[PDB]
Enzyme design. Structure first.
Site, PDB file in Angstrom:
ATOM      1  N   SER A  33     -40.830 -28.529  46.054  1.00  0.00           N
ATOM      2  CA  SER A  33     -40.625 -27.699  47.238  1.00  0.00           C
ATOM      3  C   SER A  33     -41.374 -28.228  48.457  1.00  0.00           C
ATOM      4  O   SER A  33     -41.030 -29.286  48.996  1.00  0.00           O
ATOM      5  CB  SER A  33     -41.039 -26.253  46.950  1.00  0.00           C
ATOM      6  OG  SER A  33     -40.781 -25.418  48.066  1.00  0.00           O
ATOM      7  N   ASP A  49     -39.173 -40.716  54.948  1.00  0.00           N
ATOM      8  CA  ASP A  49     -38.035 -41.032  55.806  1.00  0.00           C
ATOM      9  C   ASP A  49     -38.476 -41.604  57.147  1.00  0.00           C
ATOM     10  O   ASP A  49     -37.776 -42.449  57.717  1.00  0.00           O
ATOM     11  CB  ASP A  49     -37.173 -39.788  56.014  1.00  0.00           C
ATOM     12  CG  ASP A  49     -36.309 -39.472  54.807  1.00  0.00           C
ATOM     13  OD1 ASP A  49     -36.486 -40.127  53.757  1.00  0.00           O
ATOM     14  OD2 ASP A  49     -35.454 -38.568  54.908  1.00  0.00           O
ATOM     15  N   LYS A  89     -36.919 -29.778  43.779  1.00  0.00           N
ATOM     16  CA  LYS A  89     -36.536 -28.471  44.302  1.00  0.00           C
ATOM     17  C   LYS A  89     -36.108 -28.649  45.752  1.00  0.00           C
ATOM     18  O   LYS A  89     -36.933 -28.970  46.615  1.00  0.00           O
ATOM     19  CB  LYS A  89     -37.673 -27.456  44.207  1.00  0.00           C
ATOM     20  CG  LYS A  89     -37.195 -26.042  44.533  1.00  0.00           C
ATOM     21  CD  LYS A  89     -38.298 -24.994  44.486  1.00  0.00           C
ATOM     22  CE  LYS A  89     -38.998 -24.919  43.148  1.00  0.00           C
ATOM     23  NZ  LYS A  89     -40.066 -23.883  43.195  1.00  0.00           N
TER      24      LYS A  89
END
Lengths: 370, 83
Positions: free
Chosen positions: B12, B23, B37
């Site tokens: 999460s 990224d 998740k």
């Protein structure tokens, strides 16, 4: 001039047990003086000088802790196949004990006519028993460099087994054959060195500007500095160098130069430390002495000899940790969830894996810097 | 410099931080692939002392890739052990 020496000579000539004369005392003083300057010196008597004036196993031998030790056996040579390893202390070759033998006397005993047997006895740190190796000499052939693509990565594995007269060329051609490499794992582990021209040549292949290595003695005129030429390609691509206790001489110059220029990251374990130049000087009339005349200095001014290269990332050999030991729980298995270098080679070399992981980090850093 | 450690227990919010840093190539993700998740829960209280927890949305990393049921593949896989 030196009266204290004459007083010592007179007392042993006066009061020593055995009837001794100047001829031995001067010989024992010369051998004693040279033995207390450095461990690489030797005095050659008239008869042993003319003996010195008049195929192999593949062992590079040196001296450390005052005893004759194997630096590293060369890759693919009879000694390497026979199972001698780095750090092995040689106690006996054939008939003679080496606990008071010169480096050149050991080299002359080991090298000889091809396909002839030799017996050497060594001591190790892992075993209580002395090991006896019956090994046969052979013509020394060695492809010094081979280059392999690393599977599932863009990176390339460059292995330098030893610095022979063609190492720099074989590397440059292999890098041209792989123009999309984006990274090098330069493995010079167990490489006891070789020609200085190839250490400067291979380093100059990667370094654009600055001193690569210096040779320095007491007289500052004889001091030589090996500067890199401006003709260096591959100036930006990530390179990771692997070294271990068998890396010495040219292997430490390439590693130390790349390290001091922050051009590469050195991975592995502390190197052997061979960075000196010995020379034969004809003394008296038909005698000669071998003494160290200069030492090799890195671009940072640090010495290679007694110190060696300390890697930026220390990783002792071993297998990479198990592929897993878990039947663990993920959201992919919950209720109602919304929906030539192979891995077999890298998983046995934690040293190689650490080198690849450093290129993975390098390529990420040089991509952030867009 | 940032080096992020993640493993199969990271989920999460831990994967959002790790995924955003990955990224943007702001940090290096190290460890092993995470729980995966890729949903956002919200709880709205019903009783004075009781609440209902609902999956309300799916969250996407800055590259637009989803992590749901996949998890983050770290830049450097290693698995635990002694050196």
């Amino acid at each position: 001039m030196f009266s204290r020496f004459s007083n010592v000579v007179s007392e042993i000539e006066k009061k020593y047990v055995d009837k001794i004369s100047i001829s031995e005392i001067m010989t024992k003083a010369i051998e004693g003086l040279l033995s207390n300057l450095d461990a690489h010196s030797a005095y050659l008597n008239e008869k042993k000088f003319k003996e010195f004036q008049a195929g192999g196993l593949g062992i590079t031998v040196g001296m450390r802790d005052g005893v004759l030790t194997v630096i590293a056996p060369l890759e693919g040579t009879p000694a390497y196949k026979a199972g001698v390893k780095s750090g092995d202390n040689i106690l006996k070759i054939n008939n003679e004990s080496t606990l008071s033998m010169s480096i050149d006397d050991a080299i002359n005993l080991m090298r000889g006519k091809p396909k002839t047997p030799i017996q050497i006895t060594i001591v190790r740190k892992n075993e209580p028993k002395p090991l006896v190796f019956n090994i046969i000499r052979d013509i020394i052939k060695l492809p010094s460099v081979y280059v392999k693509k690393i599977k599932e990565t863009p990176y390339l594995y460059v292995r330098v087994s030893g610095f022979d007269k063609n190492v720099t060329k074989s590397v440059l051609e292999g890098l041209k054959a792989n123009p999309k490499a984006k990274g090098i794992v330069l493995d010079l582990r167990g490489n006891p060195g070789g020609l200085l021209n190839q250490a400067v040549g291979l380093s100059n292949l990667f370094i654009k500007e600055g001193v690569l290595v210096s040779q320095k003695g007491k007289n500052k005129e004889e001091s030589l500095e090996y500067k890199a030429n401006g003709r260096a390609p591959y100036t930006n691509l990530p390179i990771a160098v692997l070294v271990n206790g068998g890396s010495a001489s040219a292997s430490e110059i390439v590693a130390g130069a790349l390290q001091d220029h922050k051009r590469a990251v050195i991975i592995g374990e502390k190197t052997f430390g061979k960075g000196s130049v010995q020379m034969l000087l004809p003394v008296n009339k038909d005698e000669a002495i071998k003494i160290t005349t200069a030492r090799y200095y890195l671009p940072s001014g640090r010495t290679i000899q007694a110190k060696g290269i300390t890697p930026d990332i220390v990783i002792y050999p071993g297998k990479v940790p198990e592929n897993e030991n878990k039947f663990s729980l993920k959201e992919a298995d919950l209720k109602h969830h919304l929906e030539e270098v192979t891995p077999k080679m890298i998983n046995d070399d934690i040293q190689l894996k650490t080198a690849i992981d450093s290129l993975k980090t390098w390529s990420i850093v040089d991509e952030k810097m867009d």
